[PDB]
Amino acid sequence: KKISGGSVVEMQGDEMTRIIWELIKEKLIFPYVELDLHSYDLGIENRDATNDQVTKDAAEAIKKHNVGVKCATITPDEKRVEEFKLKQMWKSPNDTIRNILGGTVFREAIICKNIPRLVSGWVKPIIIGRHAYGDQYRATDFVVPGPGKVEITYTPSDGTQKVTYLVHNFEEGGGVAMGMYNQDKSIEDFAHSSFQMALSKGWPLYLSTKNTILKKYDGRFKDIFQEIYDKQYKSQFEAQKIWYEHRLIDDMVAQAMKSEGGFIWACKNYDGDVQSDSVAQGYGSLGMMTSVLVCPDGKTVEAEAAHGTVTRHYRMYQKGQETSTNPIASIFAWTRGLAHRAKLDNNKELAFFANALEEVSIETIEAGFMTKDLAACIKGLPNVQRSDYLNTFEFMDKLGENLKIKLAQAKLSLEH
Amino acid sequence: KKISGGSVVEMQGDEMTRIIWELIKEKLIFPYVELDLHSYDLGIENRDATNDQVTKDAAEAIKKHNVGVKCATITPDEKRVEEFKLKQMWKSPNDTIRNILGGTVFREAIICKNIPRLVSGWVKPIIIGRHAYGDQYRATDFVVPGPGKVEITYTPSDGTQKVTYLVHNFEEGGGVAMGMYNQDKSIEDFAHSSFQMALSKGWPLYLSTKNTILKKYDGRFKDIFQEIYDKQYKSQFEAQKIWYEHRLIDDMVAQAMKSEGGFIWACKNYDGDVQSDSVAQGYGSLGMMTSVLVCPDGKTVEAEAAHGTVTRHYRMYQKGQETSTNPIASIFAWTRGLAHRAKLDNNKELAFFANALEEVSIETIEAGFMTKDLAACIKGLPNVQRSDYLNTFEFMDKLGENLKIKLAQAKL
């Protein structure tokens, strides 16, 4: 009776998103879909117990099975070490997974007709390609305890030369220092996936850098995009009446803010992290955004919610208080992962189910059933009352109700 | 030129901002104000001729005279080198000047009551304190030509063992790499200026970092702020019913976007640079923002417009075509610096002129005389007609008349 879904790597998360994750599988996915499921618990406690090995195992599973769907996870700092009694301050599971997989994370809002934006002009989608490799997420940082010299050096593999650059000589007191890097091959994959996304969408492409400040580091990104564009993409762009343009990041954020949308924005790793949260909130909620890592092999993807574990909501959950937390981004992690699974396997029954769940989610909200974040978009936050929204479970229950109806109607249809 | 100004350091800029700079001195400052003016031309041509020495001379003059006002400048990349036939790809003069002076750059929108924002909720100001030192603006970046190890090393002054960390081992092909740093004393001054700004305006303070990712680097910023808050400002904040909170930068930008405004935002160098343009545009124009570098001495100040040289408009100016470019940010560089010069000198006349020019600028726009960007805020750009806006000359002229009127009517 259930759809045969194939192999999926599932990564369990923390706090409020872990609660939603279990409700998605129980209500939305498992009743209709049977999966060969490789489950990795990335909850903070299991990562601590495995010395973060479960995270690297999960990344290797995604390479093997080509599809993974990830819940948001805690990245610990000193406060989390004290809260959970951790052995170490573990690195972000996302940093580890993206470092191993590589590629570009494409992030885009999920639009409902009845939800007012915070930014008046965006009538079309903004799609951020976020380079998923290197920079601050692979970096090496340390505290400078006192006076002394920090240098960064490059030694070729043959060991026949050494280049030493002075970072800073600390004359009095200490500070911080860090190295970071990126790679030409990853930059080229990032460029290709950006131009290909623009052509698939019929939309212009913009790349943002600081190249006036980092002339070598950011100038490399700019050069590689320009060279790949001129050689391989430019005739196809003009044929679709679109263009590619590099801008300084600050000009770019101002242009995007005042634009009508409808463009692809290639972002360096850190910029794509921050701006995608600004963009998601600007369209009205961090809970309404898709995030899909498209790996360079053209086969493997990892779908996820780009927002965090929603700690403040989890604290209320721990007290038995009602929570209204937006599940949509977490649900679209599953739908986007299953859609790609169905595409790899040419599974029409699964491809239909994935799209059906996405339509149900939008239709439910557009019919007036929503969590508190979205009711705050329509009214003001100060004007919202309990009767204006559903709690987290009521909303999942409504979605489950409407999903059963949509799948029932499909079975009764002639198309079937 | 009756009012005695005192000593101000003037830095001349490039392209469209240069054209507006002279219009401000001619029509706005010079007729009413006599200045001891130490002028350095930071135009890209003079920087190339002096091997960027004029920039260092200018920074030194600000330390001497405590007050400086800067016009936007070109920071050259490969296209600018070829465009201007430059000797070197010179560093940004703002990087050079800020590195020498230090401190926190405070940026805030200039609000006219008739101008709609792009962001629905911001009914109260957002003030970004931007750390002006270190990080990407003091960094060392280079191309990695081929496979090999990039390492970062710390050699202490006490002769104890040198420490070496592997950044990356490039196994296939090359790439890019960079070192960057910050210093505890600069971070401490950045913290103090942020707490003091919040107490003087009466608003809560947020610091944004990535400390979950950069645990040492950004953790140091977070730890320094928290220690200074707990030991120094905390009871003062509580008595004013405000607070200080650290947030991850992701959370902070989202919170900022959906808020009502009304907070101080402490930003690391790079974040303050980018978010200040996002915020300025969100209130509706890059032309309406003040930017003042507040130096750690509590004395010296450098006022500037935070936006660039507006190359696109300048290309139209070069072709003889009509332009409408918003001068207000450039005007507020003069008024903010002259107001500071007046507080140092206890000059009631100069301080009155400084405020009056700012009043005239806002009153002129609130009466319906504005450049094209502001008219676009009200009607949307596709609906802006020629009758809705003034060109750059006409706008500077209307401000000159209103300034003349406001000073004449005040002389009575």
Ligand SMILES: NC(=O)c1ccc[n+]([C@@H]2O[C@H](COP(=O)([O-])OP(=O)(O)OC[C@H]3O[C@@H](n4cnc5c(N)ncnc54)[C@H](OP(=O)(O)O)[C@@H]3O)[C@@H](O)[C@H]2O)c1
């Ligand atoms: N993908 C990931 O694994 C990932 C990404 C980011 C952060 N994190 C981790 O998550 C933890 C919490 O990070 P944080 O405190 O910066 O942010 P957060 O708790 O995830 O979110 C902060 C605020 O954003 C709003 N929000 C975010 N998602 C929402 C949703 N789905 N529905 C309704 N509101 C939502 C809520 O606003 P209100 O309080 O105003 O209601 C929430 O309190 C950290 O440990 C961090 O390391 C993980």
Ligand SMILES: NC(=O)c1ccc[n+]([C@@H]2O[C@H](COP(=O)([O-])OP(=O)(O)OC[C@H]3O[C@@H](n4cnc5c(N)ncnc54)[C@H](OP(=O)(O)O)[C@@H]3O)[C@@H](O)[C@H]2O)c1
């Ligand atoms: N403080 C500084 O010295 C400073 C700061 C930043 C950049 N720069 C330099 O400026 C040069 C150009 O930088 P860029 O091309 O990134 O940006 P830009 O040319 O300065 O500005 C880009 C766009 O922003 C809008 N804009 C900026 N200021 C405006 C104003 N006062 N009134 C109306 N619109 C305004 C215009 O939008 P539209 O095109 O839509 O009309 C303009 O085309 C570069 O050489 C850069 O290094 C200098």
Ligand SMILES: O=C(O)CCC(=O)C(=O)O
């Ligand atoms: O991995 C983390 O700690 C945060 C990740 C994040 O903020 C993002 O993926 O946008």
Ligand SMILES: O=C(O)CCC(=O)C(=O)O
């Ligand atoms: O100095 C530069 O090159 C740009 C400065 C800038 O963008 C800013 O001050 O906001």
Ligand SMILES: [Ca+2]
């Ligand atoms: Ca993020």
Ligand SMILES: [Ca+2]
């Ligand atoms: Ca800027």
